């Protein structure tokens with residue numbers, strides 16, 4: 001069975017774990033341990049292909065050991081998550097993309113930009129700003145809410161499709 005290694009990255013509090021748990025368990029809860037980093041799996045059918053998604057939900061201290069580089073390098077695609085109510089989380093996207101390009105040693109890594117917490121009224125990052133950034137990176141942009149489930153399947157399935165496009169090259 002086909003398997004895809006997906007990694008969910010971004011600033012604290014943006015909703016990486018809530019997104020992951022929506023994908024796997026189809027629900028939202030008010031609280032998630034902010035400290036837990038681990039991998040999870042879901043079996044999915046995307047465009048008729050059955051596959052296993054192994055999802056690394058990142059967390060924990062900001063450290064750059066060689067071991068951490070090597071683990072990140074096994075990721076085949078990355079969700080770059082920010083929250084639409086947190087400008088700093090959007091500003092930090094650049095850094096996460098640089099670290100991915102560094103460990104993958106490539107300017108062509110499958111990535112999707114994800115603007116999470118789309119249900120909240122307290123927007124500080126404009127949709128247009130995010131679209132322009134994703135266009136500049138050459139990657140898709142998906143608006144999500146882990147709370148309502150808006151966009152969640154689309155974000156993960158779009159990342160799988162980006163991985164397939166890379167595999168065709």
Ligand SMILES: C#Cc1c(F)ccc2cc(O)cc(-c3ncc4c(N5C[C@H]6CC[C@@H](C5)N6)nc(OC[C@@]56CCCN5C[C@H](F)C6)nc4c3F)c12
Pocket residue numbers: 009010011012058059060061062063064065068069072092095096099100103
């Ligand atoms: C992820 C990943 C990541 C990759 F995708 C790819 C390759 C990587 C190779 C690494 O060896 C290591 C990583 C990696 N591991 C953890 C990070 C992290 N933490 C602290 C918090 C926020 C998320 C979670 C984990 N808990 N924080 C920031 O950056 C935070 C900011 C704010 C304070 C200063 N820095 C610089 C920028 F300004 C942004 N980067 C991180 C990072 F790159 C990598």
Ligand SMILES: Nc1nc2c(ncn2[C@@H]2O[C@H](COP(=O)(O)OP(=O)(O)CP(=O)(O)O)[C@@H](O)[C@H]2O)c(=O)[nH]1
Pocket residue numbers: 011012013014015016017018019029030031032033034035036058059060116117118119120144145146147148
């Ligand atoms: N309204 C709303 N709340 C969200 C959404 N996604 C996550 N949350 C909430 O935001 C907070 C952070 O959620 P969490 O999933 O732990 O984020 P994280 O990015 O995993 C935090 P860490 O970086 O420490 O692992 C929680 O209170 C969570 O329920 C969303 O789409 N909408």
Ligand SMILES: [Mg+2]
Pocket residue numbers: 016017018032033034035036057058059
């Ligand atoms: Mg988390």
